[PDB]
Design a protein around this ligand. Structure first.
Ligand SMILES: CC(C)Nc1cc(-c2c[nH]c(C(=O)N[C@H](CO)c3cccc(Cl)c3)c2)c(Cl)cn1
Length: 340
């Protein structure tokens, strides 16, 4: 019969054996397994999205993106397992390189040297350069989506919230609901942004850099608008110019209603940090998304000078441009991995 783990069919044999639980998500579970063809342990992500349109959409987007992308700092797909027919297919399993840990686990337990922070940040941005060069936004960058091997090589995972960039349709009203993880949300999400521009990811990287410096999330809000309280509590009140860029009256008037808040100096929050790291941090955690540093400028920043080499920071060859129909497309998209 099929192998099980945490009372849950893990139907991946005979190729993949000797399973141990790794982690989970909203509509599935990840295990490690032994690959009998390649003779190595691998990660296997079980996905069961077919009852929800939204989960089907996220599954399809993630599979399509990861199959197109090939980058050292981006998790790949080595294999996909599913039943031979639509009707026998209850689940999709994605086989990926097994990693030792993630940055979330590491930050709970380990002081990072400045050389580690520097190198981790370099790899994040190198992966993000490729992602953004493909006209794609990750939209949920956070420590638990950054995987590490035993020699600290880094891979970005979880493209379930990724979208093609759409900056001409980014505007929305004040307090519009948003799906991505709260602590890593850029201020404009809460004000007037759908999170359809590359600047949303730079903000999340800025939060990740801050968290590497102190082992604590920099903006740990407890609810939708508290997230913005935390941001402004450190950045201080927005400038007149930055306020004038927010044409939406509810968002503008909300900000104008708040008492003046002073900027907290980065070197007060992070008194042992490298001053170059804090200069890049400042640039990534800029309130105004138009003034926020872009990925290729971040890579070129003095903090990263030991690693910066644009000839070794590749870009994508081929950038990107109900529920029942979504299911057929997942069946189609996974066909190339089956026997026959
Ligand atoms: C020991 C660990 C670090 N090794 C490891 C972990 C992963 C991995 C860590 N996370 C994911 C992932 O894709 N997780 C998302 C949730 O973020 C998810 C999982 C299930 C269902 C849904 Cl719908 C979404 C894969 C890899 Cl690929 C290799 N080695």
């Amino acid at each position: 019969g099929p192998e099980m783990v945490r009372g849950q069919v893990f139907d991946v044999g005979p190729r993949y054996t000797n399973l141990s639980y790794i982690g989970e998500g909203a509509y599935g579970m990840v295990c490690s397994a032994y690959d009998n063809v390649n003779k190595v342990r691998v990660a296997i992500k079980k996905i069961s999205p077919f009852e929800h349109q939204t989960y089907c959409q996220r599954t399809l987007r993630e599979i399509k993106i990861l199959l197109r992308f090939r980058h050292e700092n981006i998790i790949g797909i080595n294999d996909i397992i599913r039943a031979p027919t639509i009707e026998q297919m209850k689940d999709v399993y994605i086989v990926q390189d097994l990693m030792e840990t993630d940055l979330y686990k590491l930050l709970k337990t380990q002081h990072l040297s400045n050389d580690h922070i520097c190198y981790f940040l370099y790899q994040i941005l190198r992966g993000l350069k490729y992602i953004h060069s493909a006209n794609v936004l990750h939209r949920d960058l956070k420590p638990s989506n950054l995987l590490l091997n035993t020699t600290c090589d880094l891979k970005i995972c979880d493209f379930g919230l990724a979208r093609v960039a759409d900056p001409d349709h980014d505007h929305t009203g004040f307090l519009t609901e948003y799906v991505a993880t709260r602590w890593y949300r850029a201020p404009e999400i809460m004000l007037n942004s759908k999170g359809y521009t590359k600047s949303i990811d730079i903000w999340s990287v800025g939060c990740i850099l801050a968290e590497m410096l102190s082992n604590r999330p920099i903006f740990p809000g407890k609810h939708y608008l508290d997230q913005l309280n935390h941001i402004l509590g450190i950045l201080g009140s927005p400038s007149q110019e930055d306020l004038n860029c927010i044409i939406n009256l509810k968002a503008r008037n909300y900000l104008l209603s708040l008492p003046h808040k002073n900027k907290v100096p980065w070197n007060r929050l992070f008194p042992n940090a490298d001053s170059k790291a804090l200069d890049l941090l400042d640039k990534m955690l800029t309130f105004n998304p138009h003034k926020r540093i872009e990925v290729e400028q971040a890579l070129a920043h003095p903090y990263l000078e030991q690693y910066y080499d644009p000839s070794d920071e590749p870009i994508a060859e081929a950038p990107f441009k109900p529920k029942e129909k979504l299911k057929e497309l997942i069946f189609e998209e996974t066909a190339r991995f089956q026997p026959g």
